[PDB]
């Protein structure tokens, strides 16, 4: 296995903009989920 | 008679057993007084106390079960 800074993680930090997209999708998906579950329950 | 007095047998916040015991006592006494054709006025203290303490729905359910033969207390 690869060792050292940026290599001990399951995501790439090779490109800061690809990283920004992945972090956006990751934390954004979690934050969004309760709003969409509330929407799902209301639309019942 | 105004209301049921303090009963040292049932001194705590949970009064469930106080309602139950007076309901049993009234119906045991009523059965005892009827069976010799005696006088149910002797049972009056228990009647007033259970009527004061017991929820109407508990009394009504217990009455129904006595009539059904499914009342689980001994009378």
């Amino acid at each position: 296995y690869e060792e050292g800074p940026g290599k001990n993680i399951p995501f790439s930090v090779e490109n800061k903009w690809r990283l920004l997209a992945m972090m956006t999708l990751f934390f954004g998906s979690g934050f969004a989920a309760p709003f969409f579950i509330v929407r799902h329950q209301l639309l019942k | 008679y105004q209301t049921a007095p303090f009963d040292s047998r049932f001194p705590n916040q949970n009064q469930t057993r106080n309602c139950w015991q007076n309901y049993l006592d009234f119906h045991r006494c009523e059965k005892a007084m009827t069976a010799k054709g005696g006088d149910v006025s002797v049972c009056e203290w228990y009647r007033r106390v259970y009527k004061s303490l017991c929820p109407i729905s508990w009394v009504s359910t217990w009455d129904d079960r006595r009539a059904e033969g499914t009342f689980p207390g001994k009378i």
């Binding site: 296995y1 060792e3 050292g4 800074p5 940026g6 001990n8 993680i9 399951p10 930090v13 800061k16 990283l19 920004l20 972090m23 990751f26 934390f27 954004g28 998906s29 979690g30 934050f31 969004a32 989920a33 309760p34 709003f35 579950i37 509330v38 799902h40 329950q41 209301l42 019942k44 | 705590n12 916040q13 949970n14």
Partner: protein
């Protein structure tokens, strides 16, 4: 190689990283739920138009924050990363079982999010009291999916507790006694003992609820001779230990952080700190019925539970004064982690003191099931746990990643979060004293001003959360690689560099007698 490393892990560091990622994601969910709560309450009337959905949101908010954010971050994340490093151990005792404690949590979370998506959700409160949680008042699958979520979380934490206790007892250097282990390691061992003893009792109680819902048992159903109050005893027998479980690793991290940024080699009064954590753990099992002062128990029982509960203040005060005495005479480094730790000491103290107010059963009659209780636990638990987590996170991020944070950004983040949580929760004391019930979707008009302010505070904390994500991005984006840190002589976890190699302590430390 990617599947072998990240799905098939037997490495304490990689499993710790998985727990930190999981917990951070869970924190976003929990935060979103908290903002939906405060949006419903932020003006008088109804926002969602569906009070069952409000009750589902409140219930999910608590389960996510407790089971999927705090415990995974503190025990699974910091515990797995730091405990083996702090005792010079090459891994955990059961490195493969460790991986299953982690992989049980995504399924557990999926069951919770299934509960909320089927039928009308579990609008029960995180207490899940019958008969509201029973098969009449909550017919259908939602409550059963919540029960199963808690079974999987419980198995994860019981197996984790076995792993941590075995590791800490069995895998120190042969010369190192228990009284030469760092306070964080003590805090995890004690937490693990509480989990091992408390979770099985919760498992029994929620299993009884499952069978009352599906197999026609009547543990909690008076028609069969059961008792809803039995459920409350079994739940709280777990639930009081659980609140000490949530804080104890936090107390351990605070001890390390205060010692480190005071420039000290050691915390003040080490054996007193060990004594205090063990005393809190023990007393934590004999106080549970202070959650039940309004259910109709005997006066002498209320008197006992008041008195026993108040005793916990004594060992707790020893820890608070010991943290102050660790600052005393320090060469203070005003790092962002130090700011988190000082915020912790003060905000934890405020919440602990409102706990002592509530311990008085007489006054608890008026405060029970009001916003006073919500205010108490958002100080001691919500702010205490979160401030300890953020202090540990900014302190140890460079160890785990190999990269430095921007300290000025981290200080801005602290300042925003301090304002937001105090604006959110301080006014809830007034709402409680003035009689506003908890678990309400709307309130009498008199309560409008403090609800409005509380909801405005909740948005300030949201701004802090968003900024935290940017700050982590900026550290990974800039790639400032750590060279040196100070005080390695009394902080062994740093001595293999940043990040440490996949395998550390292949050659163990040398410690003589």
């Amino acid at each position: 190689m990617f599947i072998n490393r990240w799905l098939f892990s037997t490495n304490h560091k990689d499993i710790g990283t998985l727990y930190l990622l999981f917990g951070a994601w869970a924190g976003m969910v929990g935060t979103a739920l908290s903002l939906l709560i405060r949006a419903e309450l932020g003006q008088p009337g109804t926002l969602l138009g569906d009070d069952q959905i409000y009750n589902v949101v409140v219930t999910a908010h608590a389960f996510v924050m407790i089971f999927f954010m705090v415990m995974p971050i503190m025990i699974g994340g910091f515990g797995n990363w730091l405990v083996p490093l702090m005792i010079g151990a090459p891994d955990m005792a059961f490195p493969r079982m460790n991986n299953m404690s982690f992989w049980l949590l995504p399924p557990s979370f999926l069951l919770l999010l299934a509960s909320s998506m089927v039928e009308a959700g579990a609008g029960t409160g995180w207490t899940v009291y019958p008969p509201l949680a029973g098969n009449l008042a909550h017919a259908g699958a939602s409550v059963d999916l919540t029960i199963f979520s808690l079974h999987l979380a419980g198995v994860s934490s019981i197996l984790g507790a076995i792993n941590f206790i075995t590791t800490i007892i069995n895998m120190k250097p042969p010369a190192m006694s228990q009284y030469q282990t760092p306070l964080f390691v003590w805090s995890v061992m004690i937490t693990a003992v509480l989990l091992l003893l408390s979770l099985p009792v919760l498992a029994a109680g929620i299993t009884m609820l499952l069978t009352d819902r599906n197999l026609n048992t009547t543990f909690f159903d008076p028609a069969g001779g059961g008792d809803p109050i039995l459920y409350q005893h079994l739940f709280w027998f777990f639930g009081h230990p659980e609140v000490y479980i949530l804080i104890l690793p936090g107390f351990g991290m605070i001890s390390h952080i205060v010692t480190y940024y005071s420039g000290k080699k050691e915390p003040f009064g080490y054996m007193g700190m060990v004594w205090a954590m063990m005393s809190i753990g023990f007393l934590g099992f004999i106080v549970w019925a202070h959650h039940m002062f309004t259910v109709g128990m005997d006066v002498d029982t209320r008197a006992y539970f008041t008195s026993a509960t108040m005793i916990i203040a004594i060992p707790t005060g020893v820890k608070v004064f010991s943290w102050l005495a660790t600052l005393h005479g320090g060469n203070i480094k005003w790092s962002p982690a130090m700011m988190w730790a000082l915020g912790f000491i003060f905000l934890f103290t405020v919440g602990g003191l409102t706990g002592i107010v509530l311990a008085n059963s007489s006054l608890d009659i008026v405060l029970h099931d009001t916003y006073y209780v919500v205010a108490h636990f958002h100080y001691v638990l919500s702010m205490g746990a979160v401030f300890a987590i953020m202090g540990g996170f900014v302190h140890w991020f460079p160890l785990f990643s190999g990269y430095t944070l921007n300290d000025t950004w981290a200080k801005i983040h602290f300042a925003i979060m301090f304002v937001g949580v105090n604006m959110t929760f301080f006014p809830q004391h007034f709402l409680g004293l003035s009689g506003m019930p908890r678990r309400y979707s709307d309130y009498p008009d008199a309560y409008t001003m403090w609800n409005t302010i509380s909801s405005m505070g909740s948005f300030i904390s949201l701004t802090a959360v968003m900024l935290m994500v940017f700050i982590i991005w900026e550290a990974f984006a800039s790639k400032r690689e750590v060279l040196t840190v100070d005080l390695t002589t009394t902080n062994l976890e740093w001595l293999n560099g940043c990040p440490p190699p996949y395998h550390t302590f292949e050659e163990p430390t040398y410690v003589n007698l």
